[PDB]
Amino acid sequence: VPASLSGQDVGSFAYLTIKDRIPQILTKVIDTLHRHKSEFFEKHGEEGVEAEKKAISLLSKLRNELQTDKPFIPLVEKFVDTDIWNQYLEYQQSLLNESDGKSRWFYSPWLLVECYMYRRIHEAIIQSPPIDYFDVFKESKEQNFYGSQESIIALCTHLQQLIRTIEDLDENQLKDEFFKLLQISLWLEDLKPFILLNDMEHLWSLLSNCKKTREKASATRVYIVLDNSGFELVTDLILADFLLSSELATEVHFYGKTIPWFVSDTTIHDFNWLIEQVKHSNHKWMSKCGADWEEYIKMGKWVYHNHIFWTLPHEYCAMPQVAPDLYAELQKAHLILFKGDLNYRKLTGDRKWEFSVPFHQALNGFHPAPLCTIRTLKAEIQVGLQPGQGEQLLASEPSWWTTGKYGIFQYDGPL
């Protein structure tokens, strides 16, 4: 397996992200805490203000460690994954030879660096009762929802129009509607040129055959490993409703993040809050969607799962050893959809793979069930391309894979 992406290459996007973007995220977190000082006093009294100041102090220390490339330190505050994290940090140090020194922001794998930063943010918060419940990214995730109301209404209206007629659609029209919603989940004719890899036909073949072959009382389970909250989450819920309504799935299982993560990533609180806001909307079609979605969850047609593994630094190839219960759960899927760039990085180890490497190889043994990554590119990693394809893009458009402009549907599994 190739070397990890990291800040060792000062010309790398990982370097640029660690040097400039991560400090910016921490500053904004600190700003968010500062702006909530009055709310914390109203709800918690003086102990809330002392806790806000403590959290800010800790986050300021964290930002200084990053800005000065200090070595990583063990996590201290008791938490469900503290010991697993410290074991992983010990393991990561063991990979370093004498010349490499100690794990640190601009030397260690970029995946570990970013995951460590968010876990240290969470440590600062859980060290600061009574504000230890606070989600420093909640305001931004709520803002994405409120800012997207027109597109959310339009998409909920589209889905409900679709569902009204869904039993009159032939197989090929149903397929076309499936492909449309998959592209909405990714991001339509104007955007098609920016789909670099399109395995959507293999998803249709897989689920269509499951539907045609399904025996009585048998299940077709589709798992969705989520990325961002807000409009992205809505596109995934809309897809999942279509999957049930079209009978391409009989159950949909969702996996989010146990803690606030990578700013926007959906936690159980974001998931429940968004569905509540859609359900209690006064718009006819948004409200009907939200009601239907809460009913799917009640019946077990939709299931939300929390698992700590997704907010660990480990590459997904480690899941069988580190989270065998989760791996066995994923093996019950008929299809797993992984959303977004971080999932892609974890699927491929965040390594400097050649463009030509097959996705199957880059997964490094992680083959729980048929799976597809639905991803816009925000990292210097992309495998499974045709010879010369990524090279031509680099030469024509040096930023191509880091701007979120290009997308993929990249599949591993049968057919």
Within residues 218-257, the interface with Mg ion by CB under 5 A covers: 227-228
CB of 165 to Mg ion, least distance (A): 34
Q: Specify the 3-state DSSP secondary structure of 145.
A: helix
Known binding positions: 227-228, 232, 265, 341-345, 378
Give whichever of 93 and 245 is closer to Mg ion, judged by the CB atom.
93
* Rounded Cα gap, residues 394 and 270, in angstroms: 37
Known binding positions for Mn(2+): 227-228, 265
Please enumerate in sequence order all residues whose Cβ is within 8 A of that of 33, keeping only pairs 6 or more positions apart, or say none.
52, 55, 56, 59, 134, 136
**Is residue 114 a contact residue for Mg ion (CB under 5 A)?**
no
**Is residue 40 a contact residue for Mg ion (CB under 5 A)?**
no
CB of 210 to Mg ion, least distance (A): 29
* Rounded Cα gap, residues 38 and 60, in angstroms: 20
Give whichever of 227 and 251 is closer to Mg ion, judged by the CB atom.
227
Please enumerate in sequence order all residues whose Cβ is within 8 A of that of 21, keeping only pairs 6 or more positions apart, or say none.
none
Give whichever of 160 and 348 is closer to Mg ion, judged by the CB atom.
348
How many C-beta neighbours within 10 Å does residue 415 have? 11
CB of 236 to Mg ion, least distance (A): 12
Nearest Cα residue to 232 out of 270, 198, 261, 287:
270
Helical packing angle, 46-67 and 37-44, nearest 10°: 140
- DSSP letter string, 228-281: BSTHHHHHHHHHHHHHHHTTS-SEEEEE-BSS--TTTBPBHHHHHHHHHHHHT-
Stretch that binds Mg ion, among 52-60, 194-202, 265-273, 289-297 (CB under 5 A): 265-273
- Going from the C-alpha of 176 to that of each of 137, 172, 245, the distances in angstroms are 36, 6, 15
Give whichever of 177 and 227 is closer to Mg ion, judged by the CB atom.
227
* Residues in binding contact with Mg ion, number by CB under 5 A: 5
**Is residue 338 a contact residue for Mg ion (CB under 5 A)?**
no
CB of 45 to Mg ion, least distance (A): 35
Nearest Cα residue to 363 out of 380, 392, 377, 384:
384
Give whichever of 22 and 51 is closer to Mg ion, judged by the CB atom.
22
Q: How many residues does the chain have?
A: 415
Give whichever of 160 and 264 is closer to Mg ion, judged by the CB atom.
264
Single residue of 242, 262, 316, 338 touching Mg ion by CB under 5 A: 262
CB of 232 to Mg ion, least distance (A): 8
Known binding positions for S-adenosyl-L-methionine: 232, 265
**Is residue 271 a contact residue for Mg ion (CB under 5 A)?**
no
CB of 75 to Mg ion, least distance (A): 20
* Rounded Cα gap, residues 120 and 179, in angstroms: 40
Single residue of 241, 265, 329, 412 touching Mg ion by CB under 5 A: 265
- DSSP letter string, 147-167: HTHHHHHHHHHHHHHHHHTGG
Give whichever of 94 and 396 is closer to Mg ion, judged by the CB atom.
94
Binding site for Mg ion (CB under 5 A): 227-228, 262, 264-265
